[PDB]
């Protein structure tokens, strides 16, 4: 049951990607439209890169229906359906119109769906099923890409048409809407429950009609009972009946007692003494029993809280370095595999490309599924180590090919093995990412971590090209094999924190060392501001009024500053871990 939900939700997250990039370009090329210089385009791609920007809204606000995750999912999906149907109805026959604008809107909705789906996956899945869920979601997303790319395009070419294709996709998205309506909802208690407590308590102060005292007090009582059993922040690790947990329970016990007293007064028809009872409740609220509370009721907290959560932990920078460079070898192989097969070896483009497509698809799916099953049967760290070693070793198939003869079977075998190991590593990586989140700020943290993982993959092109054009292909692939060692070293460095999180299920809190972590955070913030200024300058340059050459220097200066901050943070993190070891 749950696995079907994961599969269909991954299908949904993968469905809307192609219509803004490939099918739209095909539609323009058929109708003799260039789709260039429209000034709204080139932002459809930028939605997916910068989807981490509007993340805090997804976890700060709880919509007044379903839950926090499911309500957002339904709103995003229905917005997507309306937008896609509108896109189908729009006819570029007269002129381009705002078609790029609608495409930008659809891209934004799809990015929001991705954020919320990742957050829900992180929230609902248990520790053992993380790998299986990641594998099934990956399977669903690849299936969505497959159906959107070729099948729908062929159907529009032969039977349905460009007019009916988008209605078909909307009709296909509807069943996933009822699926997420049927989907389970996780639990989110403390901050939200105390927020509804405070809202109804403030409503009690304005209560004058003698009837909304009772209903308000009922809401407060249900919220207090729910929040009694949840755990507060900084007490997550002291979960199994700790004295501080006992005092938490004692305070909520007294709070519910005062609520019952006020409710007893209000059932008697009194109002003024009920108001005095709520005032006494608020007075005892202010006392020292108030030890833990929530992030909301302020705008600044909705943004600042996830960052402080993540960067207050221990192992915060080593995990960052691991995420940046774990799948480097696969990126180095993929960057020029096809160029190698076309020029480095004498193979035709068409059949070889198609067979590579099929073999890579099947092999990565099989690798992901097998890794998911093995990780269900194993610990996370051991599976990560095994799969990293395997994906590092499998790259040597291409060195073997480049030195060996020109038979197709050897190339097929090497491709199959490489994509299998890639799928295994992908499943383990997504499991690690889902482990690392917080279930309170899961959306923001997961989006930031995914973008951070892609950042390391982005800058591989020029170096790979220079190496392959300078020293050759077999040397390039031996180097690519030798490049998978840093990820394994990072995995072996931080195994203690991984096993601690596997056992206690809670991340620790850093306390040692001076305020050098603050200096590193300041460096990172300065680098981010410099990157934002550079992006704004590039946006202004897009108007072609004035061009500058020092932006290249500014970008690399900002990158060096950010990387220096990250490396200093990581060395401090490792030193602290070896200090608590010693």
């Amino acid at each position, epitope marked *: 049951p749950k696995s079907a939900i994961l599969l269909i939700l991954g299908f949904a997250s993968g469905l809307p990607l192609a219509l803004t990039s490939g099918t739209l370009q095909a539609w323009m090329t058929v109708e003799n439209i260039d789709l260039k210089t429209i000034w709204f385009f080139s932002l459809v791609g930028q939605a997916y890169v910068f989807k981490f920007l509007w993340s805090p809204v997804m976890d700060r606000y709880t919509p007044p229906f379903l*839950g926090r995750r499911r309500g957002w999912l339904v709103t995003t999906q229905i917005l997507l359906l309306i937008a896609i149907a509108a896109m189908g109805f729009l006819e570029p026959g007269t002129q381009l119109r705002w078609m790029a604008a609608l495409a930008v809107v659809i891209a934004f909705c799809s990015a929001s769906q991705d954020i919320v789906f990742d957050a829900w996956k992180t929230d609902v899945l248990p520790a053992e099923e993380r790998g299986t869920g990641a594998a099934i979601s990956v399977l669903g997303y690849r299936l969505g890409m497959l159906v959107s790319g070729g099948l729908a395009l062929w159907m529009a070419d032969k039977w349905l048409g460009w007019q009916g294709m988008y209605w078909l996709m909307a009709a296909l998205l509807v069943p996933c809407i009822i699926a997420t309506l049927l989907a*389970p*909802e996780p639990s989110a208690d403390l901050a939200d429950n105390w927020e509804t407590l405070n809202d109804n308590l403030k409503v009690i102060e304005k209560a004058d009609n003698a009837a909304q005292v009772k209903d308000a007090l*009922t*809401k407060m*009582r*249900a*919220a207090a*009972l*729910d929040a009694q*059993k949840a755990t507060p922040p900084k007490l997550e690790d002291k979960s199994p009946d700790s004295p501080e947990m006992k005092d938490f329970r004692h305070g909520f*016990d007294i709070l*519910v*007692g005062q609520i*019952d007293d006020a*409710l*007893k007064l209000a*059932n008697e028809g009194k109002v003024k003494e009920a108001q005095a009872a709520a005032e006494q409740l608020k007075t005892t609220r202010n006392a020292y029993i108030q030890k833990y509370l929530g992030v909301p009721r302020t705008l600044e907290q909705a943004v600042v809280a996830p960052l402080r959560d993540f960067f207050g932990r221990n192992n915060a920078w080593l995990i960052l370095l691991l995420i940046v460079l774990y799948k480097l070898g696969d990126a180095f192989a993929m960057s020029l595999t096809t160029t190698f097969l076309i020029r480095g070896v004498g193979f035709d483009a068409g059949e070889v490309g198609m067979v590579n497509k099929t073999l890579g698809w099947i092999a990565t799916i099989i690798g992901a599924l097998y890794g998911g099953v093995l990780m269900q049967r194993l610990s996370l760290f051991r599976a990560l180590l095994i799969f990293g070693i395997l994906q590092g070793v499998s790259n040597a198939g291409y060195w073997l090919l480049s030195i060996t003869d020109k038979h197709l079977m050897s190339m097929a075998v090497a491709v199959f093995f490489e994509n299998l190991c890639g799928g295994m590593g992908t499943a383990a990586f997504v499991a690690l990412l889902m482990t690392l989140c917080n279930k309170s700020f899961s959306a923001t943290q997961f989006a930031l971590l995914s973008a951070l993982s892609a950042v390391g993959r982005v800058y591989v092109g020029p170096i790979a090209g220079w190496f392959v054009e300078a020293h050759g292909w077999p040397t390039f692939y031996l180097f690519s094999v030798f490049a998978a060692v840093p990820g394994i070293l990072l995995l072996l460095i931080c195994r203690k924190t991984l096993e601690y999180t596997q056992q206690t299920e809670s991340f620790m809190m850093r306390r040692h060392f001076s305020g050098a972590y603050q200096f590193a955070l300041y460096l990172l913030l300065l680098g981010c501001l410099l990157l934002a200024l550079w992006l704004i300058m590039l946006a202004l340059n897009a108007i072609d009024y004035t061009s500058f050459s020092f932006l290249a220097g500014l970008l690399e200066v900002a990158a060096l500053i950010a990387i220096a901050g990250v490396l200093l943070g990581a060395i401090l993190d490792y030193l602290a871990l070896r200090r608590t070891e010693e």
Partner: antibody, heavy 124, light 109 residues
Framework: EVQLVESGGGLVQPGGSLRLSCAAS????????LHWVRQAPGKGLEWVAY????????SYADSVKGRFTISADTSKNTAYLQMNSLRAEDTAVYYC?????????????????WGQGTLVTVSS | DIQMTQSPSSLSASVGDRVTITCRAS??????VAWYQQKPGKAPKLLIY???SLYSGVPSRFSGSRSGTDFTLTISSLQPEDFATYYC??????????FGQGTKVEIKR
């Protein structure tokens, strides 16, 4: 030697008044709030009234308010439910359940001990 | 007065099959739901309290769980003695006590 016995069915005027007693042996009525629950013949349960003698609190359901009155005496270790101006729909089996004090596990095991029931039937 | 629209509304299963009963609270109630079994001609007995916790005296066959505002009662191995009426009661406050409808399923053999 532990039990909770209810009594009170008898011959009264139709649409008149009648008092029921719930005497509990093995535990005092001070320590547990006493609730009267009615089940109609063939239909489901519904909570009718409650009295708590620790604070003197008392409450009645909306569909019965203003006509019933539930009292108790702790020296005799029993509670009473006096029903006046009865209507045809009132006939049912009355159980006298108990509920523990907040806080603790006594509150959470609501209506842990029940009663054999008394058939209060109103008719002419 | 608002319930989810469902096409399959009835059940038909034989002896020895795992069975489940569900009820949904209209608003948030916390984990204050109890499950009672009443055999014909007797006062109801307390099967489950807190929707998941259990005291002494009851067979380990019965279990309960909660998700959101849904509460479920599970029986693993159906027995000849399990045929009675089953009530879920929310008992949030002393005065706001409400009972469920009740579910009785007959004998399959």
């Amino acid at each position: 030697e532990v039990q909770l016995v209810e009594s009170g069915g008898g011959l009264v005027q139709p649409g008149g008044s009648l008092r029921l007693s719930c005497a509990a042996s093995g535990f005092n009525v001070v320590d547990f709030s006493l609730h009267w629950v009615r089940q109609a013949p063939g239909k489901g349960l519904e909570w009718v009234a409650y009295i708590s003698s620790s604070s003197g609190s008392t409450s009645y359901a909306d569909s019965v308010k203003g006509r019933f009155t539930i009292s108790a005496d702790t020296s005799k270790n029993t509670a009473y439910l006096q029903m006046n101006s009865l209507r045809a729909e009132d006939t049912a089996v009355y159980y006298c359940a108990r509920w523990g004090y907040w806080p603790g596990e006594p509150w959470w095991k609501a209506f842990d001990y029940w009663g054999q029931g008394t058939l209060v039937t109103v008719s002419s | 007065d608002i319930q989810m629209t469902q096409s399959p509304s009835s059940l038909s299963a034989s002896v020895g099959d795992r069975v489940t009963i569900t009820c949904r609270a209209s608003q948030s109630v916390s984990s204050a739901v109890a499950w009672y079994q009443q055999k014909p001609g007797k006062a109801p007995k307390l099967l489950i309290y807190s929707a998941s916790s259990l005291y002494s005296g009851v067979p380990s066959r019965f279990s309960g769980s909660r998700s959101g505002t849904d509460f479920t009662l599970t029986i693993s191995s159906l027995q000849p003695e399990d045929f009675a009426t089953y009530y879920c009661q929310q008992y949030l406050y002393y005065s706001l006590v409400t009972f469920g409808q009740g579910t009785k399923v007959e004998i399959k053999r």
